[PDB]
Design a protein around this nucleic acid. Structure first.
Lengths: 50, 114, 59
RNA sequence: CGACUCUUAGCGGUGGAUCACUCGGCUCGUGCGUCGAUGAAGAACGCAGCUAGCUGCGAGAAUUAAUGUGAAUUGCAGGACACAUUGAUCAUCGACACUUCGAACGCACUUGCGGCCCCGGGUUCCUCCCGGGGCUACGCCUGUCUGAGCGUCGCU
RNA sequence: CUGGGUCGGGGUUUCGUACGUAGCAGAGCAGCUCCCUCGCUGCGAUCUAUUGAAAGUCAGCCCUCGACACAAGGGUUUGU
RNA sequence: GCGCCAAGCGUCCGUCCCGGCGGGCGGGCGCGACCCGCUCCGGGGACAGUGCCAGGUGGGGAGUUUGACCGGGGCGGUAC
RNA sequence: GAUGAACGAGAUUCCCACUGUCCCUACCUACUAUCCAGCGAAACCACAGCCAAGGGAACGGGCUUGGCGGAAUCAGCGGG
RNA sequence: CGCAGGUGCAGAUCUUGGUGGUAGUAGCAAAUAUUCAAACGAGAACUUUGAAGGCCGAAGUGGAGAAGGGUUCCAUGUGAACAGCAGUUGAACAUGGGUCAGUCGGUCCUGAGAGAUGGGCGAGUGCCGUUCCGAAGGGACGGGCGAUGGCCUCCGUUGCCCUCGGCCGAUCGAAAGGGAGUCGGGUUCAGAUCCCCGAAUCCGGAGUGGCGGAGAUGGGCGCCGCGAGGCGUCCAGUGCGGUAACGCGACCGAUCCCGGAGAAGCCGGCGGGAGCCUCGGGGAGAGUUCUCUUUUCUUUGUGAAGGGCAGGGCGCCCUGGAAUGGGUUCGCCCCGAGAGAGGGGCCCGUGCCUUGGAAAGCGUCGCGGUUCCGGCGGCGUCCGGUGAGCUCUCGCUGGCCCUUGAAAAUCCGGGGGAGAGGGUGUAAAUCUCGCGCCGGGCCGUACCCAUAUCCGCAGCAGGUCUCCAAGGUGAACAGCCUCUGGCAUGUUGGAACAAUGUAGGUAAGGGAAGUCGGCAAGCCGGAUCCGUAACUUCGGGAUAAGGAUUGGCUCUAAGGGCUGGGCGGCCGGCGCCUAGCAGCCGACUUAGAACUGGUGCGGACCAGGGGAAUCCGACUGUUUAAUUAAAACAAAGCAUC
RNA sequence: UCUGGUGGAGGUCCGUAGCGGUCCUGACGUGCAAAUCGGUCGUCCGACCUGGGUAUAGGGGCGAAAGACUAAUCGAACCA
């Protein structure tokens, strides 16, 4: 809701910032094994632990 | 007909969400949130059902920004007691004190003569 | 400006005055969904925001 | 004649078995055998030029200093290091630093509200406003100060 | 020796007299009039005539043959 | 109705003033408001109550059991 | 126990009215089912799948003896 | 050649993974509905624009919030995967951006309750307990005794001692309870009572007085001054008015004490105010004009905070003394404990005028620059009437209760008078009066709020707390149609119209003969006028049963409000409103009649079939969420312990 | 005593919103749905409906009592 605490807002801020795709240059790093961000979270599909 | 919405996040018809209709210079109808109705002081006597006269009927916290004349009547027990019961206590005080002097004199005279 | 989350309007006003040599009329504060604090710093009428922005280098 | 169906072989495909490999486990054995109010374990939030996760770190945040080493780091870029007017990188690590919760410590768990003593700025000993610093938890030991008691007494 | 369509005519049939116009029909009511009652005007559901009228009728009704354009074109196969 | 934060007396001060006493100004103590007596007042009381053992009651509760043969089992029988 | 006005989405009988419940079925409408473009499951599955009698674990798709048997399919159906 | 095993699979409704036939099959059928053209584009049944036809029909498919979600919000781009057809589209993917407050909440207070310490219990982590087995005050008028700093004659800060002093105990507990104070106009792609403009307001501070005003500036004795007016002395002065209710701009005062406000249920009936609807005109723009319609549609403002005036209310006051009782309400109710009558007082004032204010906003007609100038200009934003109308709100007055319908922070008034001030200055202490100066920190704020942002594994016919609420018909927030606003028919389309089905109808003559059973369907249905039985706990049964009417049109009768009563007045006998007369204004109904239609009329919509009995339970109520709503349970009453 | 008014009582009746869930033993029954949909129904000023906050926790709670409910789990939940 609009009414939220500071602790909850800071928790939602962090999940928002970590929902980004992998950068393109990571694939070029020597000995790289990551192809995509397997921890992508969609708001409608998966809900937060909160 | 234009329909209205609340101007605040309280969506319930509570005692602190009362509103009235006002027409703006923009020719729009909006809600204005109203203060609660104040009550004038009730007399300290405890027998008079009506409120006191000469005192503004405002909410208690606004009472401290008014002048003293708006909060009292120029009389003994001014803004706390009604005139009728102030009159009765003046007479009740005087007449009981009169009876006490009479009783003391009667018992002193009776003691002296007996 | 983007400011520290542990900074109130009094600290923001004093800081902006100290490192930019300008007078502040009022400060408004917001915390973004990113998590950082955004300050809207209205300057005094004597000072011009565009001239200050040129000296800082934001335009 | 086909079509359709069945079988076999070749080739091609929904598929990922087998074989080979292994910076992983499991088991046995050896030496040490060290946390914390000087704030532990565990959480939270942050920190990279471009970097989400893992990792490392704490406002000096993918690291400072010091010592050893001795020319790199690297996915791209940028500029150090002139590669001794002593030093890239890495390792080690004894110096410095170490946000918010947490036994968690001013009260309370909401970025809520204080108190005492100092410092700076507005005004000038309003300590009124703002900023900063140090204290302000429970139990308990030795000592210290201030006390109570028709407790036991002495001098009055 | 044309053809089948599409419109249009006509037959059949269904319902039940269309709009407009006119009326001296219409329960009554209002106004003018003279200065005050003849007439006139207006409102008014409904009624009468025009008007067995109006409307629909193959889309799986019947006959036209009057108008309009179109119809020798296309694709896939088949042999004793 | 009102009711407290002493009136009034009796004494002691001033490093305080004005003529040892007096006056003024500011204070102190005692009585007013008695003295003494060991538990605040009252009600119970070596009982109640508590600890330990002993007897009774105790499906409120716990755990368990409720044979076998058998023209299915049960009932009946015992051919157990 | 007996009774009893008012009440009851409680159980029951009869009567009036009403009706497609029925004699005895028919027609109409919408959405399906149908066919097409696109998308696209699941249950279930020893092998499979035409009958009669026989015998058989005493009710066979398979065995014996007869009847017979002709690609690939569509919409329905409820005997197995 | 020896040694040692986790050493051989067809089964175990075996375990994990992979794959078939079914099968291009079932299916993509709940809530009426789409069509034409154009644009972009490789590509259009599905996107966008325009024009048509429809729906939600204000208890909405509308506009906003609370929970919950957490970036889903906004712009640009892509069309790989997903959105069960497509897609130029998206709540998808990618890149950027977006939430601004002293006066809106949190924050503060307590509620039901939760919870430490003291104490007690407990092997123990710990538990009970919240005033109960505690020496539970760390504060303060004031006074004294000392240090210290200053705009230092003096005052202020700091320690110690008297005096006062119940926390009737920490602390937590509400984004719907309590709780000071903000509202107009404009502005964004997305913010806004938060930004800009404007106009206000509350709280706190101001010491070294910020400026005024108040307190507070009189009287007596004389002298001089022609006299006014000044000199000396003495004595007052913590305001004033009204018979009163109370009033005026302030109008000292501590510990202590009393009281008030915060702070009270539900239902009914009346009245006031506003908003909305309605009616009659006047403007501006638009629609229709085949014929009529001087028409039909839209639009036709003044925030908070001050000042004044209506209006509403009053168990408030003064005079006075009432029966031949009177006053008065829809109802009531009121009076020698003071009616009626007259005159005052107070409270509220959300209404009107006014400052704010027209400069702004809106409507309309034009003229500019250029993407925006809150550009510029002209005209207007007018006058009335109605009402058991609806909604909100303010009042008054009743009914009900073996039900009586919070607490605390916080603020105020009064009683008392411990104190302070100055000796006549142009003064003091003091001031809840007017203006002036400074500040108000922290957190939330975007958007969805649901037939697509929440929960149900999903864009799931389910579930999920509220606010506003137009026209017509009509008893209605019923159903039906429409306007403001919204939408695209609910995860696809084209063609056809077979069986069977789901949903909706109709049916000749019979009229329950069907069936366990009138199950299902059908009959009745509104309102007005008549008329209503047995039985009964006398309340009912009752819309019992039964009958008649109902349209359209044209009339008639009745049902009300205001004003007046012999150029402008008035000193006057001269007038007499008196079966209530004249004029003006106005809305909603009721009853009766004529005429009239192919006897059709509560014409759609809405909308009880009835009667005679038996059994059970008295009635209202409750119950097995997901097969039993009942005779089961409860219940008042009765009785027992 | 009768009559006509006024008045507005009630765990009063019809009936919206709301709350519930009778019958069709209708639809659906690999559903829209691990209980939904339609018509028809009960109640609708009260023993009424409902949000938030609070309290009661597994041999325990709560129960106008059906062994009902206690997170799709109840004749003792769920987790290890």
């Amino acid at each position: 809701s609009s009414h939220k605490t500071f602790r909850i807002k800071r928790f939602l801020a962090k999940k928002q910032k970590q929902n980004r795709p992998i950068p393109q240059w990571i694939r070029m790093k020597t000995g790289n094994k990551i192809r995509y961000n397997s921890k992508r979270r969609h708001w409608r599909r998966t809900k937060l632990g909160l | 007909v234009q329909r209205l919405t609340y101007r605040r996040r309280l969506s319930y018809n509570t005692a602190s969400n009362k509103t009235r209709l006002s027409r703006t210079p923009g020719n729009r109808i909006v809600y204005l949130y109203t203060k609660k109705v104040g009550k004038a002081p009730k007399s300290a006597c405890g027998v008079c059902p009506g409120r006191l006269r000469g005192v503004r009927a405002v909410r208690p916290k606004v009472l401290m920004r008014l002048s003293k004349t708006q909060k009292h009547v120029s009389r003994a027990y001014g803004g706390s007691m009604c005139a009728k019961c102030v009159r009765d206590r003046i007479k009740r005080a005087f007449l009981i004190e009169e009876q006490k002097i009479v009783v003391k004199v009667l018992k002193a005279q009776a003691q002296s003569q007996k | 400006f983007i400011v520290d989350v542990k900074a109130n309007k009094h600290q923001i006003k004093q800081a902006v005055k100290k490192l930019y040599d300008i007078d502040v009329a009022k400060v408004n504060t917001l915390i973004r969904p990113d998590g950082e604090k955004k300050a809207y710093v209205r300057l005094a009428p004597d000072y011009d925001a565009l001239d200050v922005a040129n000296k800082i280098g934001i335009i």
